[PDB]
Amino acid sequence: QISVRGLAGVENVTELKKNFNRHLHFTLVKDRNVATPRDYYFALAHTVRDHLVGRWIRTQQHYYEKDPKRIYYLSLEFYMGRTLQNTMVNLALENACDEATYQLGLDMEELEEIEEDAGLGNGGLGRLAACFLDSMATLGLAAYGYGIRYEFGIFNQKICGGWQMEEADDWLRYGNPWEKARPEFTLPVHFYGRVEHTSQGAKWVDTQVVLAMPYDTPVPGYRNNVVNTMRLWSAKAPNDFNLGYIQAVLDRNLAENISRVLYPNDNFFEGKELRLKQEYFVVAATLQDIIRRFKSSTNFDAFPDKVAIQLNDTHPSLAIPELMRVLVDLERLDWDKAWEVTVKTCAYTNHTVLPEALERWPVHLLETLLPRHLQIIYEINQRFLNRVAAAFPGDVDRLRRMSLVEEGAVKRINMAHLCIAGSHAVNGVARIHSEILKKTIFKDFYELEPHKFQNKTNGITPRRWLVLCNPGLAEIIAERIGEEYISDLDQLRKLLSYVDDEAFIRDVAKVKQENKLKFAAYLEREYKVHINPNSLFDVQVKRIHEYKRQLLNCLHVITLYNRIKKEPNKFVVPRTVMIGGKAAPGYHMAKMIIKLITAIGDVVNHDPVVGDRLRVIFLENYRVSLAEKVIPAADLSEQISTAGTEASGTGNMKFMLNGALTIGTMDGANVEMAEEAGEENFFIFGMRVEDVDRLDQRGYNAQEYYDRIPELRQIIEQLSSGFFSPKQPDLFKDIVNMLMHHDRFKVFADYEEYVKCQERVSALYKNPREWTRMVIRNIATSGKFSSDRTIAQYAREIWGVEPSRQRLPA
Amino acid sequence: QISVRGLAGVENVTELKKNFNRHLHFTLVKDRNVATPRDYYFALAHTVRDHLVGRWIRTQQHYYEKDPKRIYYLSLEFYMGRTLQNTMVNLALENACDEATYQLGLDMEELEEIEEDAGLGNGGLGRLAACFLDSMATLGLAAYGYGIRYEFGIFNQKICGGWQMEEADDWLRYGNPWEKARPEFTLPVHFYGRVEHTSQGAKWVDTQVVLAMPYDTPVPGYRNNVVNTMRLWSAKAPNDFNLGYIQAVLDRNLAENISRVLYPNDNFFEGKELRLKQEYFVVAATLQDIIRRFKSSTNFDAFPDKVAIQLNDTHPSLAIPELMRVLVDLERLDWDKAWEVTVKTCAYTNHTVLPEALERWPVHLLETLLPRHLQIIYEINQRFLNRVAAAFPGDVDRLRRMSLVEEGAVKRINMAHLCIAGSHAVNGVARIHSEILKKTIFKDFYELEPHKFQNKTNGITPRRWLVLCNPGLAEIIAERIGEEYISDLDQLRKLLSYVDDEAFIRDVAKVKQENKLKFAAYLEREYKVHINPNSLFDVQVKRIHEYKRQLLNCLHVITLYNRIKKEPNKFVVPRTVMIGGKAAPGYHMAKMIIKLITAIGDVVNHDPVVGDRLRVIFLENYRVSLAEKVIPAADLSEQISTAGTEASGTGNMKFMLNGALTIGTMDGANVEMAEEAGEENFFIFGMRVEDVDRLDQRGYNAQEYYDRIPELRQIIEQLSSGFFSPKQPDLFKDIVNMLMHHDRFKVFADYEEYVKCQERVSALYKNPREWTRMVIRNIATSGKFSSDRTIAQYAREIWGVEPSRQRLPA
Ligand SMILES: N[C@@H]1[C@@H](O)[C@H](O)[C@@H](CO)O[C@H]1c1nc(-c2ccc3ccccc3c2)c[nH]1
Ligand SMILES: N[C@@H]1[C@@H](O)[C@H](O)[C@@H](CO)O[C@H]1c1nc(-c2ccc3ccccc3c2)c[nH]1
Ligand SMILES: N[C@@H]1[C@@H](O)[C@H](O)[C@@H](CO)O[C@H]1c1nc(-c2ccc3ccccc3c2)c[nH]1
Ligand SMILES: N[C@@H]1[C@@H](O)[C@H](O)[C@@H](CO)O[C@H]1c1nc(-c2ccc3ccccc3c2)c[nH]1
Ligand SMILES: *Cc1c(COP(=O)(O)O)cnc(C)c1O
Ligand SMILES: *Cc1c(COP(=O)(O)O)cnc(C)c1O
C-alpha cells in the first residue's frame, strides 16, 4: 500500500501464508473452525519470529569471531511495549505480512491490537532504555541490555468513580513468543551470610543462594540484519531450598519473589529490602555473565578494552563494589589494579535532581544483606576521601559533603556519590540538566575531577515513534526526500525547502486530520466517549507528578470554562483537553490530581452552555501502545514542568516528530528543542531556572498571586467551596492547602504567563495555513532528537567504539 | 533393527532428519556447534510431537461429530513417567527415529535418558491412572483424564549417610514439550463465602475466586491414530486479587499454592486444608468443563447417557455434592431428579482397606471452606438414612454405622460412604479385595444395595511394560506368534506350545541375561556400585510401608548372612538383593526401614568371607523410569504384604510380564496371578486372610515366635545390641520394639514359611532350564493382567460403552 512499509513480492507472500498455516496447525494446535483472533495473532507472531532466528544466530556468531568491545547496558527497567509491528518494520516485512494476512481473510491491524505491552518500566527512564537498544542495534554495536524479567509489570490503571484503581499486569498469561528461556545458563546469586578474614583474603560465607535464570529477547536493527540480545533474569529457588516438607516447598516463593513485580514509583525512591534484593540480583548475575564471556576469548588489564558497563542511574550501582569483590576476593588482584579496571569499565548516567528520587540506602540493610559489599564501600570511601583531603587540604566541610557515607540518626550510603567515584564518565541527559549537575548537586565532584562530567542529550527512536506509529506522515516525507531519513534523522532539515509548498502544507494537515479522526473513533469504540475532531487536541500525557504540573493545566482548563460561562455567546477556538498518566499507588497527592481532572470533566462535559467548545477527557491506562495512538493525533504538546525539575523529558520529542506544536517552560530538553526549531516556532512561557532561584531566595508566597489575580482567586474559591464536588464539598481541601501554603513547584507563579501563552496558541490555530507552516518548521528540525544521535555520542565519547551503518549478510 | 519397533523407510527418515534440523534452528535457536545433548533431546521431542498434532485435532473433531458417550476419569494423581519413547511406540516411529538420529551422529537411547519423569503420583494408584489412559485410547473410547498440574511432583530421593533426604522435583524447569496451555478455557473456582436462602433457592455468596487454567497433554492409542486428552488444571489468581500494592501482588501466591505440590503420602490420609482445596479445585473446574461440553451438542435426563464420571478413590468425591449443587442451585432441577442424574453418572473405585488411608474430613473444615457442599452432604445423609430405616426398621446401630457423618469429639464426613450413596457402581481392584469390601468394611451397604458392588481386577499396559522397557523379550515373542499380542495380550497363551522348545528356552534366558548385564552396567556408571550379573536378582521395589513388609525381606537377608558366617565354605546360590522405594517424608518408621536396609548393606557388602555370594543394594530414587530398567532385569519378584492388606498391587504384574518368578503371599492380585499360572509355578507362602483373622481373635504375641525360633532370636539380638550400628548401638530400638510389641502386620508370623520358601527358590535357580520353563509358564499366562482387559470390563459393565479396535484414518 505505502512505500516505507516495503515490498510485497509474490514469493514472499506465498511463503508467509504457508508458514502462518503451519504455525496455526503445529504450534497452536487449532484449525480455522475454532481459531480466535488471539490464535491468529500468535500464528503471525511465530511466523515473523522465524525471520529473526537466522540473523540472531549469525549476529552472535559474528561477535564471537570478530571479538569487538562489548557494551552492557544495565537497567532495572526496559519499557518495550509491543514487538510485532516493530519487528516487521525493522525487517521490511510489514507490506508482505499485510498482504499475506489480507489474502487469508484477516485484518493485520486488528491482530496487532491483541498483543500485550511489555510494560517493564514506569515511564521515561525505562522507555529511554528501550529506544537505546533499538539505536544500538541499528548502529551495529555489540550491545546487550540486562535487566529483570518481572512477572508483573507496571499496573493496569482503571478509573472507578473518577479514582485510580490498580490491577496486576499479568502480561505473561497467554505466553510471550518473543523470549527464549535459557535455563542452561542459570547462575547463582548470594545473599546474607557473613565475612571471614583468612590468611589469603576475605571470604563471604554462609550465604543464601537464589538462582538467576536468563530469558533472551531479540533486538533487531533497522534493515541491517543485526539482531542484538536483551537478557532478563528471573529468580528461581534451588531444589534443596529449605530442605515440614509441604511448607518447605511452598516457601520457595520467598526466593522467587525477587523477580515478581516492578516497583511502580516514577522518580521517587522507596528504600525497601525487596528493591535492594532486585538491584543486587540483576548486578550479580549480569557481572558473572560478563566475566564468563570475557574469559572465553588471567589478564584483566584488557578488561576495559573489551567491556563497557553503562549504569542507568544508580539503580545498578552495586556493579561497582561487585566488580571489586570479584576482582579482589575471587581473582586475587591487588586493590589498586582492580580499582583502575573498575573505573575504566564503568560509566554512570544521572537522570534526576529531585532529592526524593536519589537512592540513599540505610547502612543496616546493606550490613545484613550484603556485608562484604558494605566493607568494600567503606574502603572505597576512605581512599576517595584521602584524595579529596590531598586536593583541598583543611576543607573539612567538603569531606563531609563528598562522603559516600551520610551521617544522621540513620547512616546511609549515597549511591550517586559511589557511582561518581567509581566511573570514568558521568553524564546528564540534557544540556541544562548536565549544567545543573556541575553547578549544584555534584559541584564538589566536578571541582575534583572536571574531566569526568559530560552531557548526552536524550533522544527517541524514529522507527517506533514515526514510522511505526505515524505511517501517513512517514510516507509524505519519504515522497519528497526518500527513505534515508529513517536512520539519519538530520535529513529532515531538507523539509525546510517545502515550507511554502502548497501541496506539502495540504498533505501535512491532511495526515494530522486523518490521525485525529482515527483517534476520535478509537475513543468512541473502546470508551463510549464522543469528541469533536475539528477541535484543537491539547494533550498532556506523562506520569502524574506535582513537578510535571498537571495542576497548572487544570487551572487553565477551569479558566477557559469560567470565561465561557461569563461570555457564552463569544467565539472561542474549540478544544479537547486530554490528560493521561499513572499515579504511583502510594502517592496520595497524585491520586487526588487524577480525581480533580475527572471531576472537572464531570462539570465541563455536561454543561449545555459550553456545548462542544470544551471537552476534558482523562485518558485511562496511559502506556506505550496508547502513546503510539494519541501522539500522532495531538495538536498541542503540554511540557510544563517547573524550570529545573524535568531532567530531560522524552515525550516532548515524540510530539515534535509527529506534528504537534509545544507549549512549554525552558526546562530539560525543551531548551534544545526551542533552539533547534527557533524560539519563534515554540510557545515558551514562564520562569527560567534563574527566576525560580530568585523567588526561592526571597521566599515563595502563593497568597500574593491569589490576592493580585481575580481569575485565580475565583478558581480557588470554586475548589474550596465544593463547586467540582457538590456531594463532598471539602474533597479538594488538600489540593487547595498545598497550592496556598507548601507548593514546591510554584504553580501560581507561572499561571498568568501560561494563560496568556495559551491565548497565542488559540490565535495561531485559527489560521490553519500558518499553524501548519510552524509545524513543518518543528518536524524539519527534530533530527537532533533521534536516539541514533545520542547513541553515537555515547559510543564515541564514553565507550570508545565506532558506530557502523553497514549491513551483515542476510 | 528389531521388527516390533516398525519400519524405517527412506522417505520417513529423510523427513524426520529435516524436521529435527528445522526444530534445532527455529524452535531451539541453536546451531550444531553449541548444541548440547539436552538441545538434541528437545529437537527430537518436537519432531515426534508434530506427528501427534493432526491425529489429535482429527480425534477431537470426530468426537464432536459422532457425539459418543464421554468417559471422565477424575484423579488427583497421574504417574505418567517419560513420554518420548511411548509416543514413538504408539505411532510406529521408533525404528525411523533411531535411524534418523543415527545418521545425524546421535544415540537416541542417550537422548531418551535426558527426559524428566512426569511424577505426578505417589505409586500404584497414580500409575494405574496412567495405564488406564493408555488403554482407553487404545480401545477407541472417548475418554478424558482430569487432574492437577502440580508444579512439584513426587520428591527426588537422595540417600545421605544411609538416610532418605528429599529434594523438590522441579520437573518443569527446562519446559514440558508435551503440554499445550489453553488459557482461553480458564474457569473460576469458588471458596469460603456463606449461604443465603432466598425465595428461589440457596445462593453461595461472598466467595474468594481462584482461576483454573487447563494444560492439555495428548494420549496416543496403540497404532490406531486415536489421540485422547489429559487435561490438568493449574491455579491462577485473578488480576484484581487483593486489589499496600507490592504486598497484594506478592500475596497472589496464597491462591496459586493450590497447584504447587503433590502430597507425598502413599496409602495414608492427612486431613490438611490445602489438600481439601486441591480436591475441590479439580472437581469444580472439571465439572464446569463437562457441563459446557454436554450443552454444546435444558434436558439433563440425557446427561447420564452422554457422561460417565469415574472417581479414582474418594479423592474427587466432592464431584457428587458439586454435581448436585450445580443441578439444584444453578440449573433449578428438583432434588429427586438431580439425584437420579448424579447417581447414574457417577461410579466409585475403592483402592484400599487400611483405615489410616480412608478420607474422613472434619466438619469444621468443610463448614468454613465449602459451606453449601456441607449442607448438601447433610441432606444426602438424611435421605439416605431414611432409606436404611425403611429397609431395616429398628436397627439403630446400622443407622450409626452407615451414616455419612461420624460422631466423636470431632465430627467427620466419611467420604467412602458418600461415594457409595452417590454412585451406581462401586468396585474393588482385585477379586479378594472386592470380596473383603462386601464382607467387612462395606457389608452394611452391600446388604442394602447388592447390585452396586463389582470387581474390576487391575492391569498394566503392555505397551510401556513390555514393548517399551523390554524390546528383546517383545521381539522373541513376536518371532513366534506375531505382533497382535501387543493389543490382545491373551494371545501370550500361545507360548505354552514352546515350553519344551529348546531354541525358545535359550532365547528367553538370553534376553534376561542381556537385561541383567545392561542393568549391572547402569549401576556402575550412575552409582559406582559393582554387582555379579550371574547372581539371582532378588528385587523388592515399591513404596516403603510397614504393610508391604520390606522388614520381612530384611530378616531373610540377615538370615542368609548369618548362615554364610556359620558355614562359610558351603555353597550357596549367589544373590543380589535389591530393595528400593520412597518413604513419605513424615513417616518415621518407613525412614528407619530405609536406614536399616543401608546399614545391612554396609555390613554384608564389605565382609570378605561373604565375597560376591550376597550383596544388598538400596536402589535410590525409585520412580517409573527406574522401574523400566530394573523390572526387565529381575529374576525374583518380592510381593510379600500381609494377607488382606495390599488391595491389588500392580508391580507384581509388571514383573510377571517381564520374566521374573514371584515369591508372594495370597494377597491382592497375587491370588489371581497364581490361579492363572498354576500354583505349582508360583512361590506361595504364609498366612492366608483366614489365618490372619484366626491370629487376631486369639491375639498376636510376637514373643512366642522369638522364643521358638533360634535364628529369629539371633537376628533380634543383633539389631538390639548394635551389630548393624556400632557407633549408635540403640539406633534400631524403635524397630525392635515395634516388631516385639505392636506389629500390626505380623512379620514374625510369616518368617519361618518365608525362609523355607526362599530355599525352594534357590534350589530351582540351580537348574536354569527348569527355572526358564517356569518363567515361560508365567509369561504365557500373564494376559489377564493387561489394562486393556480391565478397561473393556469398566466400559461394558460400568460405563455402558463398547470398546473398538478400529483405526481412525491417518
Ligand atoms: N516455549 C516457550 C514458552 O514457555 C513461552 O511462551 C516463552 C518462554 O517463556 O517462549 C516459548 C518458546 N519460545 C521459543 C522461541 C523460539 C524462537 C525464538 C526466536 C526469537 C525470539 C524468541 C524465540 C523463542 C522456544 N520456546
Ligand atoms: N524524570 C526523568 C526524565 O526527565 C527523563 O527524560 C528520563 C530519561 O532520562 O528519566 C526520568 C527519570 N526517571 C527516574 C526514576 C525512575 C524510576 C525510579 C525508581 C526508583 C527510584 C528512583 C527512580 C527514578 C529518574 N529520572
Ligand atoms: N510454549 C510452551 C511453553 O511455555 C512450555 O514448554 C509448554 C507449556 O507450558 O509448552 C510450550 C508449547 N507447546 C506447544 C505445543 C504445540 C504442539 C503440541 C502438540 C502435542 C502436545 C503438546 C504440544 C504443545 C505450544 N507451546
Ligand atoms: N495400595 C493400593 C494398591 O494395592 C493398588 O494396586 C493401587 C491401584 O489400585 O492403589 C494403591 C492405593 N493407593 C492409595 C492411596 C494413594 C494416595 C493417597 C493420598 C491421600 C490419601 C489416601 C491415598 C491413598 C490407596 N490405594
Ligand atoms: C515517552 C513516554 C514517557 C515519558 O514522557 P515524559 O513526558 O518525558 O515524562 C512516559 N510514559 C510512556 C508510556 C512513554 O511512551
Ligand atoms: C507399578 C509401580 C508402583 C506400584 O508397585 P506395587 O508393588 O504394586 O506397590 C509404584 N511405583 C512405581 C514407580 C511403579 O511403576
Side-chain angles (χ1 to χ4, degrees), chain A residues 31-294:
Chain A
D31 73 335
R32 299 216 56 184
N33 300 319
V34 305
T36 56
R38 175 167 285 101
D39 297 316
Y40 294 133
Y41 157 70
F42 278 109
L44 185 57
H46 282 92
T47 300
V48 169
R49 176 183 95 177
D50 284 343
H51 290 260
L52 284 168
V53 169
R55 293 164 169 99
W56 201 11
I57 288 171
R58 278 181 293 203
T59 302
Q60 298 306 307
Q61 239 158 45
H62 177 75
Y63 299 159
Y64 182 72
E65 290 174 13
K66 298 299 99 194
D67 199 33
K69 185 167 183 179
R70 309 295 218 280
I71 313 307
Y72 296 102
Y73 196 86
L74 268 62
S75 188
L76 275 279
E77 303 186 18
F78 286 96
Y79 204 163
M80 301 297 281
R82 298 167 170 165
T83 298
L84 175 58
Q85 204 187 347
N86 188 244
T87 306
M88 293 191 295
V89 168
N90 284 357
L91 301 179
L93 279 177
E94 204 167 14
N95 272 338
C97 288
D98 206 10
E99 186 62 34
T101 56
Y102 171 81
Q103 291 180 19
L104 298 174
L106 302 163
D107 182 349
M108 190 170 73
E109 206 178 308
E110 186 190 314
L111 301 187
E112 286 164 349
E113 287 304 316
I114 294 159
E115 186 175 358
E116 305 289 351
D117 288 39
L120 306 186
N122 274 288
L125 180 143
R127 180 60 233 179
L128 185 76
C131 287
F132 281 6
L133 295 186
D134 180 88
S135 287
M136 288 182 299
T138 293
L139 294 182
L141 300 177
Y144 302 77
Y146 275 93
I148 299 175
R149 178 183 179 265
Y150 302 106
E151 190 170 330
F152 299 95
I154 186 64
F155 64 86
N156 285 316
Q157 182 189 59
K158 288 209 174 310
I159 301 301
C160 292
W163 298 99
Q164 169 170 302
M165 300 293 293
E166 302 90 21
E167 279 190 359
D169 165 42
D170 194 13
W171 73 293
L172 297 166
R173 179 188 282 262
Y174 295 95
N176 175 12
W178 310 110
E179 71 188 4
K180 182 65 192 82
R182 298 294 202 195
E184 67 272 28
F185 306 139
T186 297
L187 293 169
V189 174
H190 292 85
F191 294 99
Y192 303 104
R194 60 187 175 82
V195 181
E196 270 171 17
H197 294 274
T198 75
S199 301
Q200 47 172 15
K203 277 159 59 60
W204 183 20
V205 300
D206 296 346
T207 50
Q208 290 178 31
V209 173
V210 178
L211 303 179
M213 174 170 300
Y215 286 73
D216 286 351
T217 295
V219 180
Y222 183 73
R223 267 110 115 152
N224 65 351
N225 305 314
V226 172
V227 181
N228 285 341
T229 297
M230 175 177 66
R231 176 161 279 183
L232 303 179
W233 299 105
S234 181
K236 282 272 285 182
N239 293 346
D240 58 0
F241 188 84
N242 281 35
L243 281 168
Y245 169 75
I246 293 296
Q247 194 61 54
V249 174
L250 299 183
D251 286 350
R252 293 170 57 98
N253 302 327
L254 305 191
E256 301 180 345
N257 282 344
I258 290 163
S259 59
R260 195 78 70 201
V261 59
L262 170 73
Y263 273 79
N265 307 315
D266 183 91
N267 220 169
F268 182 82
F269 174 62
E270 197 185 339
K272 292 285 149 65
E273 191 193 38
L274 185 60
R275 173 65 176 201
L276 184 57
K277 283 173 178 192
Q278 291 181 334
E279 294 182 346
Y280 185 61
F281 179 77
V282 63
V283 158
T286 300
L287 273 169
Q288 287 174 80
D289 219 27
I290 287 169
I291 287 165
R292 181 193 50 73
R293 197 176 284 117
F294 173 75

Side-chain angles (χ1 to χ4, degrees), chain A residues 29 31 61 170 182 236, chain B residues 28-29 31 61 170 182 236:
Chain A
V29 195
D31 73 335
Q61 239 158 45
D170 194 13
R182 298 294 202 195
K236 282 272 285 182
Chain B
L28 298 179
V29 195
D31 73 335
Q61 239 158 45
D170 194 13
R182 298 294 202 195
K236 282 272 285 182

Side-chain angles (χ1 to χ4, degrees), chain B residues 79 122-124 127 465 541-543 548 622-624 627 639 646 649-652 654:
Chain B
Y79 204 163
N122 274 288
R127 180 60 233 179
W465 299 113
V541 287
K542 50 191 70 240
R543 291 289 297 257
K548 294 178 186 283
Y622 182 63
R623 62 197 183 283
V624 172
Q639 306 297 334
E646 191 75 84
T650 53
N652 50 4
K654 302 169 197 175

Side-chain angles (χ1 to χ4, degrees), chain A residues 348 350 352-355 358 360 401 414 416-417 420 433 435-446 453:
Chain A
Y348 162 54
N350 172 279
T352 192
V353 305
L354 296 173
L358 296 176
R360 298 177 232 254
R401 297 195 300 269
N414 185 317
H417 293 182
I420 294 163
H433 171 240
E435 289 301 306
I436 285 169
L437 295 181
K438 291 186 281 183
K439 295 178 196 291
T440 67
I441 58 167
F442 304 143
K443 184 175 183 287
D444 292 320
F445 295 86
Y446 175 71
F453 288 82

Side-chain angles (χ1 to χ4, degrees), chain B residues 174-440:
Chain B
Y174 295 95
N176 175 12
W178 310 110
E179 71 188 4
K180 182 65 192 82
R182 298 294 202 195
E184 67 272 28
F185 306 139
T186 297
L187 293 169
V189 174
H190 292 85
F191 294 99
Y192 303 104
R194 60 187 175 82
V195 181
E196 270 171 17
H197 294 274
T198 75
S199 301
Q200 47 172 15
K203 277 159 59 60
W204 183 20
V205 300
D206 296 346
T207 50
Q208 290 178 31
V209 173
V210 178
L211 303 179
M213 174 170 300
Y215 286 73
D216 286 351
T217 295
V219 180
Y222 183 73
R223 267 110 115 152
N224 65 351
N225 305 314
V226 172
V227 181
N228 285 341
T229 297
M230 175 177 66
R231 176 161 279 183
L232 303 179
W233 299 105
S234 181
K236 282 272 285 182
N239 293 346
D240 58 0
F241 188 84
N242 281 35
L243 281 168
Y245 169 75
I246 293 296
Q247 194 61 54
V249 174
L250 299 183
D251 286 350
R252 293 170 57 98
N253 302 327
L254 305 191
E256 301 180 345
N257 282 344
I258 290 163
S259 59
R260 195 78 70 201
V261 59
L262 170 73
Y263 273 79
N265 307 315
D266 183 91
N267 220 169
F268 182 82
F269 174 62
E270 197 185 339
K272 292 285 149 65
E273 191 193 38
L274 185 60
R275 173 65 176 201
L276 184 57
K277 283 173 178 192
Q278 291 181 334
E279 294 182 346
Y280 185 61
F281 179 77
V282 63
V283 158
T286 300
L287 273 169
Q288 287 174 80
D289 219 27
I290 287 169
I291 287 165
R292 181 193 50 73
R293 197 176 284 117
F294 173 75
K295 285 186 179 181
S296 311
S297 290
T298 41
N299 194 221
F300 283 94
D301 289 302
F303 195 74
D305 299 325
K306 292 301 188 195
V307 176
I309 294 172
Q310 192 69 35
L311 305 176
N312 201 27
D313 216 89
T314 59
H315 312 153
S317 63
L318 288 170
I320 291 160
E322 176 66 6
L323 186 50
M324 287 294 290
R325 188 187 73 81
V326 171
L327 296 174
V328 173
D329 293 351
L330 306 185
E331 303 291 342
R332 316 291 296 147
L333 271 51
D334 65 281
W335 183 277
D336 292 323
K337 177 61 73 185
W339 187 241
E340 188 173 76
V341 167
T342 298
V343 166
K344 290 171 64 178
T345 300
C346 297
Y348 162 54
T349 304
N350 172 279
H351 302 256
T352 192
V353 305
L354 296 173
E356 63 265 38
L358 296 176
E359 294 193 290
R360 298 177 232 254
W361 287 104
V363 164
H364 68 262
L365 274 179
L366 287 159
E367 207 182 345
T368 306
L369 195 65
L370 302 169
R372 184 55 184 144
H373 296 77
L374 184 65
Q375 291 180 354
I376 288 163
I377 287 166
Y378 285 150
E379 188 69 33
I380 292 165
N381 191 48
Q382 202 202 320
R383 290 170 184 257
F384 184 67
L385 291 180
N386 284 345
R387 284 178 64 209
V388 175
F392 297 99
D395 192 348
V396 292
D397 204 69
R398 186 184 291 262
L399 295 177
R400 190 193 57 74
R401 297 195 300 269
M402 292 182 82
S403 175
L404 280 55
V405 185
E406 286 184 8
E407 298 299 332
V410 63
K411 285 191 207 295
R412 297 172 180 273
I413 308 302
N414 185 317
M415 306 312 270
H417 293 182
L418 170 64
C419 287
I420 294 163
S423 294
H424 73 94
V426 178
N427 76 283
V429 290
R431 193 174 65 220
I432 192 162
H433 171 240
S434 298
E435 289 301 306
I436 285 169
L437 295 181
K438 291 186 281 183
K439 295 178 196 291
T440 67

Side-chain angles (χ1 to χ4, degrees), chain A residues 11 14-15 163 168-169 176 202 330 402 451 457 500 516 521 539 543 558 614 632 654 658 662 668 715:
Chain A
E11 217 103 79
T14 302
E15 213 64 16
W163 298 99
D169 165 42
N176 175 12
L330 306 185
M402 292 182 82
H451 55 91
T457 301
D500 302 310
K516 290 170 72 177
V539 183
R543 291 289 297 257
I558 300 163
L614 183 62
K654 302 169 197 175
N658 278 285
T662 300
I715 294 168

Side-chain angles (χ1 to χ4, degrees), chain B residues 475-511:
Chain B
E475 182 66 4
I476 67 173
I477 294 169
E479 282 177 33
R480 271 76 176 189
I481 69 177
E483 291 191 0
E484 286 177 19
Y485 75 90
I486 297 166
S487 60
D488 184 14
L489 205 63
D490 289 316
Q491 288 195 42
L492 291 182
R493 286 217 164 243
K494 291 172 185 174
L495 293 177
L496 292 175
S497 66
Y498 295 93
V499 74
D500 302 310
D501 187 86
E502 280 301 316
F504 193 60
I505 291 159
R506 178 178 305 114
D507 286 348
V508 172
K510 180 166 168 180
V511 167

